[model samples]
Target: MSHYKSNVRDQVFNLFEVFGVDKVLGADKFSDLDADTAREMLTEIARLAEGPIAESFVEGDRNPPVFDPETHTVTLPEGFKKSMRALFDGGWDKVGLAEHLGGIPMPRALQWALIEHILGANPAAYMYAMGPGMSEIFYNNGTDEQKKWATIAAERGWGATMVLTEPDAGSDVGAGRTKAVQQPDGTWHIEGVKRFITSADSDDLFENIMHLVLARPEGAGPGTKGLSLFFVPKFHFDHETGEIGERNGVFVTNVEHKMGLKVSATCELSLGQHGIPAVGWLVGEVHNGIAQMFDVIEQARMMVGTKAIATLSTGYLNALEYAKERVQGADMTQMTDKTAPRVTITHHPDVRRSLMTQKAYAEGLRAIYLYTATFQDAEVAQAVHGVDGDLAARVNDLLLPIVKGFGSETAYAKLTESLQTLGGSGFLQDYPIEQYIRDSKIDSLYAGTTAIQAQDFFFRKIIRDKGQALAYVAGEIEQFIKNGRLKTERELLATALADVQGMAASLTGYLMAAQEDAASIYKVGLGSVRFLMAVGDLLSGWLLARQAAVAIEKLDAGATGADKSFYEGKIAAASFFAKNMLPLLTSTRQIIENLDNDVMELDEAAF
Candidate 1:
């Protein structure tokens, strides 16, 4: 049996009823898509994801990609390649890409919903098939020439990569020593080595690959402000015909032997060191390289977060399936009987709680991402959240770290419950949860670490945006709190809203207090992540409760069988998060509000 399973009903509920994606899906720019056509596409995507894409999941983990340093090639397993072929052949990677990519226009909500399947079924496959989407970003920030290249790159179905990390620079992108020099021609020569580059090479994967690189121009200032985004290709291609020319100077120097996700190559790339100059074109012919690269960074942050959430969903479903059929101890009521009939572990209270926790976060994070996606497009944002274009973008910016940071941390942290639910079987390689854990461990570390996200959340999103987007979302939750439906859940979310607001106020207070004493800001740093996490819980609870209200109405309208259970699960997930998860925010705020710099003042010599 395929280990992958998609919660299609919940995904649909999120897109249609809970978030109102249909409001802007069928008309305007999305004239090409609607609710029915979308479901048909999603169902087809599910069919493809749950079958061929998931086929290599287990085998790929056992026999991971092998690197041949002599040839600078990554030899991916046939099983893994076959899975990617399924995705490529299915035309599943084109959704939400540029129109030249042959993708149907749809709301970002449904687009991500469809992507959730592939991301969940086989994240490595999703990573390899991102050429069109990543190229689309280059197109958005491209010059006229690079824009033409983007259209050709996506049309030709090439593989792509984000090249930023170096031997010394990782999170601190400004520390990169890579240098770019303008040549006689407009192109520049990029020289230096980059580390942790994903999808740098794969045997027979693509006819050509593009590396969107970051290198400082000669005589530029230090730090990220001086960095410029360059479009470097693995093979030089004919500009007119879009055909392969000669091999470029960039080469994969080494591929890591990782704990998981071995099918996806994590490579060390050397630029302009192997007898050839690494030639690259400047993006948009502009000096705003850091701002240009932020597009890619934000896209990557979204993908990393979604990948973790998708893994958690499948892991939870797998655990839930096991609990339903794996017979274990007798019911608690029958413990006194020596020969009582054995019962499925689902009958136990702890198992139920654990499963519910998994369900809540898996579904809750799904809601969070889909909700964030609504703010991607102006029409969708205005339809759903009543925000204009600028505010819509701010809303997306505001939630990215939370989605990418809290989503990843919570998903990876909670998959332990998924493993625990399986008892001894969870520890075995025969099952997929172990691989899920190993694969998801990088989500929080990559894109941006959770600590980095916390800082970005406070400084860039809340502070830079002047709290406009944050207040918009907070106001939505405040309105939901006033409503009478699901009164208990409403009350729970109301308290969570207060807790999050209180933390936000406390952090802002710290920002103000720092004007008098610099040490005061350290208290904010000490508690910013807690504030980030508390706001995440608040948003998750609000979205889930919104989902529950829709489910309650659907159930009241009456359903017969699977329909009944489907809606019931929605209600249960939301209710569980509201009662069990949201209540934790109160104490979370208390801790945040009381933060101090005592920990920072501790002596380093004590260690």
Candidate 2:
């Protein structure tokens, strides 16, 4: 059996029960999708994910992709390619994309929920199938002539890459020196070596590869402002006929050997250096590259965050199943009796604690991402939360860092609890938890590191917007607390809110103090990550309590069978999260209020 375990029930609850995603469907742009259709889609995708899509996950890791330096190509295993074909042949890759790109119209939340299964089953497989999504972005940003090219790429099932990172410009993208020189034919010739490019070259999986590269034009200034977005392809094709032509100048130099997600090739790409000029066209014939690329970056951030949460969900389920079957010592109460009956580890308090921790974060983080997605579509936001499109966009901006940063950090941390649930078996390759640990570590490090996300959360999302968006979300939490269902849980949520607001106030004060003492701003940097996590906890706790209320209503209405256990678990997880995790924000709040710059001022020799 495949190791992946999907929680379609929990997803249904989040979408229809808690968030009421159905209310906005069967109307407007989503005229084709309804609640029933959404449920069926989730079920079908889950089956596909747990079967053929997950079939090659283990083999792909063991026998990864083979890179040929001479041919400048990476050949994936046949099994992995089979999984990739399963992904695209079903047209699942176009779930959240635009209708013009041959995608079904649905709420972003539903799309993400379906995507969660694929990510949990095989993250590498999902990465390799990102062509349709990237082509959708290209079409959105392309000029009139370029739109047809973008559609052709999508229709032909070509591979795609967002070429931004260079050897020197990993995080600081503005420092990239790749130059784009305009030729006599109005096309630009790109010259540079870009590293850490995903899916740069896949031997037979794609007929062509579209590279959306960022390069500085000739005599342009420095930094990100001077950079321009270019559409470069592996093979030059006829615009009208879509027929394959001569090879472009781009070539894969080397592919990296990663710690995990080994099936997804991370390669170095050399442009316009091998006796052939790399022909390129400017996107939209415009100069605003960074602004246009944000569309792709935001999608990546959401995908990375969901991938981490999905992995944790499966990891916890695997451990939960193991704990139920693995019998160990006698129960704690019967320890004194030599002839006492031995029970499963679930009977032990510590084991229960570990399982609950994993369960809370897994479900809690799932709630968070879905909640964030409600704001992704204005129609859904208005129907569910009674908010306008502008406010909804701002709210999405406020929550993304938390979804990406805190979600990644917490999921990775709680996966350890999942591993611990299996005792010594977790450390062995006999179980999937060991591989889960290795694969999930990169989520926090990439799509902007945890530190970078924290900084962006405070400066760009909060301070830049003057807390307008944050206030709107805080008001929702306040209203939830006011409309009490779980009294004790609401009280804990209220305290968490105060603690988060306290941290925010302190960080704002540090920014204000920067007018006098520049060093005080460093204090904000010191406490920003903790503050981001605190807000995430507050949101998680709030959403769990909201879910608990729904579960209680159903239980009161006589929900039975497997749903009885499901509802009971929901209530307990909410209570557990409130009592156990929310209080940590109090200590974090105190630490943020007493921030100092001693570390910043300390000498390099002190280390």
Candidate 3:
């Protein structure tokens, strides 16, 4: 069996039993989908994801792809390619895309549930197979002709690459120096070298590859706004017949040597430098490149967050399974009894602490992502949350950063604990935890760093929105607490809710003070990441408690078998997080409230 053991039952529980996703599906927009159909899809996809699609996980990591600079080609491991083929064969790639592009119209909640399994089983495979999805973004932002090509790309299963990030400009997308010149033939000529282009070159993986080029047009204004998005292909195809033709100017210059996720080719691409010029057309025939590229950026953020969360889920499950069987030292009470029989490490208090911590973060982050997805369902937003289309859209915007930022940060941090639970075996290639840690590390770095997310959460999501979404979410949490859904855990849930409210007030106060002193805002910025994390905890606690409440009802109704242990575990995990983890936010809130501008005040010369 692979490291990934997807809890489809639990996922279904979250979707239907807890969040009432079935009710949302019954709404007019999603009248085609229902609980039974969704569950069947999830179960079938999970089987494929955990079986053949996961077969190459260890092989791909152990024997990563080989890059031949002379050929400008990336040779993926045979096993990796096979796994990717499995994913494509399963037709799982069509979920969550626009129906016009041959996708199945479904709620984001169900879409992410399918993604979680694929990501957990083989992240690189999932990434390499994301071409159609990426092209859909282009289709949405492209001109009519380009939209036609985009749909063709999706139907033909063409591979795609996002052409951004030069050696000089990484996080600073606006600093890219790639230039595009208008030609007499009405097509633009792209000239530049782009590094870290994922899936830039794969040997016969697709009939063609599309390069979404970001370059500054000649004599355009400075910064990102001046740049334009162009669709550059690997091989020029006859537009009339959609048949292959001469090679395009884009060529893979080199491939990167990475710490993990090596199966996905990370290539350095050189454009328009060869004899043939890289021919491209401006997307939407417009100059708003940065805004156009945001479509891709937002999708990438969601993918990155889901990747991190999926990795952590598998890591925790691996550790949990190991702890249940691996024998270690005796219990704490028997410390002096050296001759005592060895017991499972789970018998130790600290092992339980570590396992519980991993459980909290893994399950908590899962809940966070699922809740964010709920807002994406138009039906769920209108029916459950009582928000119209516009407000639902705004709420989705407000939660994206949290789902991506908090999910990535917490999952990475906790996977370390999961690795520790395995002792020295973790550092070796014997277990998947080490790879999970390495692959997930980039989650925080990419998809806009934690700092960027913090700023977005504070300024755009909350302050700019005038706290409408936050207030709405908080009101839901308040109702959940006051309704006594989990009377046995009421005191802890109530206290956790109070702490979160206090933290929110402190943050709101800081924002209000920022109106008077601009520097006061820096305090908010400095502590914004912490604040984001606290909110994640608060939301996770509420959701988990709600799950426990449902589990309690199910248990009372005589639910048994494996579900008994699963429900019991859910309740225990929620209680553990509220008691042990959520209280630390008080101190974090205090630190934020007392933040100073020391960093801003530092003189450049002092460095």
Q: What TM-score would every model get versus the actual structure?
A: 0.98, 0.99, 0.95
Q: Looking at candidate 1, what is the lDDT of residue 475?
A: 88
Any idea what lDDT model 2 has? Answer: 0.92
Clashes of 1: 0
Candidate 3 residue runs with Cα over 4 Å from true position: 26-32, 484-518, 603-607
- Clashing pairs in model 1? none
Expressed as tens digits, the lDDT of each residue in 1-607 for candidate 3 is 8777887887888888887777867546566877788999999888887888888988887888777877677788888788888888878878787788988888888899888999999888877878899879888888888888888888888988888889998878899999999999889999999999888998877889999989999999888888899999998998756798899999997878888887778888999886789998899998988888888887788888888888899899999998899999877888999988899999988889999899878887888788888887677777666788877777878888888898889898999889999888889888888989888888897668988887888888988998888888887888877784466455666776676667667777777888888777676777789888888888888888887888888888898999888889888988887778777877876676677788889998888
Q: In candidate 3, what residue range of length 10 has the lowest lDDT sum? A: 484-493
1 or 3, which is superior by TM-score?
1
Which residue runs does candidate 1 get wrong by more than 4 Å? Answer: none
Candidate 2's residue-wise lDDT over 1-607, tens digit each? Answer: 6989999999999999999999988999999888899999999999999999999988888998888977888888899899889988899988877888788999999999999999999998888788988898899899889899999888887889899999899788899999999988889999999999999988798899999999999998888888899999999999987999999999998888888888888899999988899999999998888788888889889989999999999999999999999999999999999899989999999999999999998999999999999999989999999999999999998889988999889989999999999999899988889899889999998788999899999999999999999999899899989994499999999999999999999999998999999888999999999999999989889998888999999999999999999999999999999999999999999999998988888999999
Residue 140's lDDT within candidate 1 is: 85
Best by TM-score: 2
Candidate 1's residue-wise lDDT over 551-575, tens digit each? 8888889865997887788788888
Using lDDT as the measure, the top candidate is 2
Query: What lDDT does the true structure give each of the candidates?
Result: 0.89, 0.92, 0.84
